[PDB]
Amino acid sequence: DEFSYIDGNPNGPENWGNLKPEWETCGKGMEQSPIQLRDNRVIFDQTLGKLRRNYRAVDARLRNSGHDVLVDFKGNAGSLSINRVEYQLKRIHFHSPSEHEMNGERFDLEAQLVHESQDQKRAVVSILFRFGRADPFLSDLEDFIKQFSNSQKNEINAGVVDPNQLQIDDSAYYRYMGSFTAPPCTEGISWTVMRKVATVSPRQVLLLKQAVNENAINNARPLQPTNFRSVFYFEQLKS
Numbered sequence: 749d750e751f752s753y754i755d756g757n758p759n760g761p762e763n764w765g766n767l768k769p770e771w772e773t774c775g776k777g778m779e780q781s782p783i784q785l786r787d788n789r790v791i792f793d794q795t796l797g798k799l800r801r802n803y804r805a806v807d808a809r810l811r812n813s814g815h816d817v818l819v820d821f822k823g824n825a826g827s828l829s830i831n832r833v834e835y836q837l838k839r840i841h842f843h844s845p846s847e848h849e850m851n852g853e854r855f856d857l858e859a860q861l862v863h864e865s866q867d868q869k870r871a872v873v874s875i876l877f878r879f880g881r882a883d884p885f886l887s888d889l890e891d892f893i894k895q896f897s898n899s900q901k902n903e904i905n906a907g908v909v910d911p912n913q914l915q916i917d918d919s920a921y922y923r924y925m926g927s928f929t930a931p932p933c934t935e936g937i938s939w940t941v942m943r944k945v946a947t948v949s950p951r952q953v954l955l956l957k958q959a960v961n962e963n964a965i966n967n968a969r970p971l972q973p974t975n976f977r978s979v980f981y982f983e984q985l986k987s
């Protein structure tokens with residue numbers, strides 16, 4: 749699991765796919781994430797509907813992987829519905845700066861909600877943030893996040909973590925097929941990236957960045973080629 753976000757280094761993002769056989773798709777796959785999201789190339793699909801979530805507050809652990817901080821839910825944290833297929837919410841990864849761009853703009857943080865169906869299909873819902881008012885979700889975790897920095901520990905019980913504190917506006921999003929954004933960069937992942945940009949405070953991002961290894965202080969994978977794949981867009985009109 750040594751990989752780095754330092755461009756130019758032997759273990760850096762351009763080389764991920766040559767580091768070990770298990771990571772080859774990082775270099776050779778053609779539906780890699782993240783990508784550029786461009787309004788002028790989207791296919792509109794009114795048929796997708798408002799994003800259908802039913803999430804539940806539940807017991808969680810915070811983990812420092814060394815290259816990101818994530819929330820790891822212990823109980824059943826509820827689920828996301830796409831095409832009446834149901835995907836359970838398992839984890840939330842944090843990346844600063846953002847990995848996705850929207851019309852050429854890179855944001856200050858991205859949160860990625862990883863879900864898994866019983867069929868084991870994967871869907872990720874991404875939220876993009878600009879510096880502003882604190883994020884209510886991270887507020888309730890700040891003192892736990894701090895402990896990665898004021899101590900030796902790399903897991904922490906965060907108790908009950910509520911995903912309905914997340915800044916998700918269900919009325920508009922992008923949708924496309926992609927990959928995990930870190931090794932093993934596996935494909936077949938449905939991505940939903942929320943149009944509405946949330947806010948997070950600088951203090952909150954700093955806490956996150958304090959937590960990780962040095963080679964991961966910025967932990968965004970560079971944008972990958974779109975390669976002609978389709979990008980769908982839904983947006984609910986006032987009518």
Ligand SMILES: O=C1O[C@H]([C@@H](O)CO)C(O)=C1O
Binds near residue numbers: 862927937
């Ligand atoms: O699609 C994803 O890739 C990231 C990974 O880069 C985390 O470090 C993750 O877990 C996702 O939600």
